[PDB]
Amino acid sequence: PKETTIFAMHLGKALDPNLPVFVKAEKDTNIKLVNVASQNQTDQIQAYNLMLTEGKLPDIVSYELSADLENLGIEGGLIPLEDLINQHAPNLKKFFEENPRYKKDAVAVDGHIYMIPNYYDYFNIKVSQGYFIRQDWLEKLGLKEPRTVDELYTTLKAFREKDPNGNGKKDEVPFFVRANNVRKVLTSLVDLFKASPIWYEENGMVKYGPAQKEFKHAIKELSKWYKEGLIDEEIFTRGLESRDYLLSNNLGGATDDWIASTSSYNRNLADKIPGFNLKLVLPYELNGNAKTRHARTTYLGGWGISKDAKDPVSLIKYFDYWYSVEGRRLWNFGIEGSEYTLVDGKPVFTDKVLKNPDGKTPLAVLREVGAQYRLGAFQDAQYELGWASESAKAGYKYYMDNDVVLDELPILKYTKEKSKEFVSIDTAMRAVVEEKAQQWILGSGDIDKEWDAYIKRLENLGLSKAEQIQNEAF
Ligand SMILES: CC(=O)N[C@@H]1[C@@H](O[C@@H]2OC(C(=O)O)=C[C@H](O)[C@H]2O)[C@@H](O)[C@@H](COS(=O)(=O)O)O[C@H]1O
Ligand SMILES: [Ca+2]
């Protein structure tokens, strides 16, 4: 009756193996997954950390933080995969032969492969988030598109104060985000100010975003915008339904979010909110700086086979199934005759995905059947092109043609001892950044008074050492 245990979460949800996509993989592979993440869990980091203190690791370990996952491999919790691939995973073997660049994302410094990344279709679509504004609200209030951060401030104030949704209530939420943890909340707020909450490249050197003066300015500005009601008062708690809720109730004025799914709302709300026009704009300029650091990475997270799995050969065959023509189509597009049909050998989505009766993104519908569930699969840009609006496709080209996107820093790989030390310092600093950034934005601490002590705290945790490690690995 053999069960396969897994730890898998994504976007705050424990994987449900009864979703249509995984029922089909179960039928095709004979693998019956049982999640050791339970259905009430939503914090993937605390769940993972807790799972490690179990007795046994589950057979398959999926995690979004790939440096942590690779450290589990280095420590022996995840087994090397390269011989299992070479002998039992022909689709993966072919994928790695055909894509050496992607193969290097998977190979650790000691030469073993401890995880299959979940790859984006990066050499086809490299942009990710873009800035959007309610063009219909600008028009109703007689305003031009703001082009700098200060004009955006004035525009958001006017959205807040001048009832652009026309209902006689002071209900507007001028700028909002969509995220399921603090780092991703900060990701969609500090880039406005040319800052970053993570590591980034500056002229061949690697630097920590939160330790920079542009991060202090971003936070101090956000704190002032928060006090004046220009950014959602619930930025940190609203969760992943923020965008659906704020847009569909005609409260949200502007955001920074993934281009294809944010572009889906014009069609989706066309009847419910006449004239709704949430429109992509180039990143607002800050003293002539036109750049954004929103770019797709080559992969996100991954999964590996634990040292405690009884049957690693049947598990590597499961990993491989997702790389056949059919398994990769299943993962990306969902079920034939439900989410898509074949027209000339190629999938065309149905109205269930493209014209959801209740206002759902096409991507939201696809995720409800288990498509696009981050594990260790290979995204296919044709799935995204199959539901992306014409304004989404023009949007990608808009950001590329204007050269506003700075490439993401690769996630770097380190030797055994440095890798353990880097992830330890990086995680401890991340906690400090998220604690202080919240207090400063929410108004319970004063950034001007506390910034220097905050810097000393990061330094005392090891900022210099992590920085040295990042620059050796670069
Ligand atoms: C690999 C994965 O599931 N990535 C998640 C992102 O998914 C992308 O979303 C879109 C889109 O237009 O929304 C297009 C891509 O095809 C799809 O991979 C996305 O859901 C983000 C949202 O995170 S957040 O912005 O920080 O909330 O989450 C990634 O995990
Ligand atoms: Ca109003």
UniProtKB/TrEMBL annotation:
<feature type="binding site">
    <location>
        <position position="169"/>
    </location>
    <ligand>
        <name>Ca(2+)</name>
    </ligand>
</feature>
<keyword id="KW-0732">Signal</keyword>
<feature type="binding site">
    <location>
        <position position="172"/>
    </location>
    <ligand>
        <name>Ca(2+)</name>
    </ligand>
</feature>
<protein>
    <submittedName>
        <fullName>Extracellular solute-binding protein family 1</fullName>
    </submittedName>
</protein>
<keyword id="KW-0106">Calcium</keyword>
<feature type="binding site">
    <location>
        <position position="171"/>
    </location>
    <ligand>
        <name>Ca(2+)</name>
    </ligand>
</feature>
<keyword id="KW-0472">Membrane</keyword>
<dbReference type="Pfam" id="PF13416">
    <property type="entry name" value="SBP_bac_8"/>
</dbReference>
<keyword id="KW-0479">Metal-binding</keyword>
<dbReference type="GO" id="GO:0046872">
    <property type="term" value="F:metal ion binding"/>
</dbReference>
<feature type="binding site">
    <location>
        <position position="163"/>
    </location>
    <ligand>
        <name>Ca(2+)</name>
    </ligand>
</feature>
<dbReference type="InterPro" id="IPR050490">
    <property type="entry name" value="Bact_solute-bd_prot1"/>
</dbReference>
<dbReference type="InterPro" id="IPR006059">
    <property type="entry name" value="SBP"/>
</dbReference>
<keyword id="KW-1003">Cell membrane</keyword>
<feature type="binding site">
    <location>
        <position position="167"/>
    </location>
    <ligand>
        <name>Ca(2+)</name>
    </ligand>
</feature>
<keyword id="KW-0564">Palmitate</keyword>
<keyword id="KW-0449">Lipoprotein</keyword>
<feature type="binding site">
    <location>
        <position position="165"/>
    </location>
    <ligand>
        <name>Ca(2+)</name>
    </ligand>
</feature>
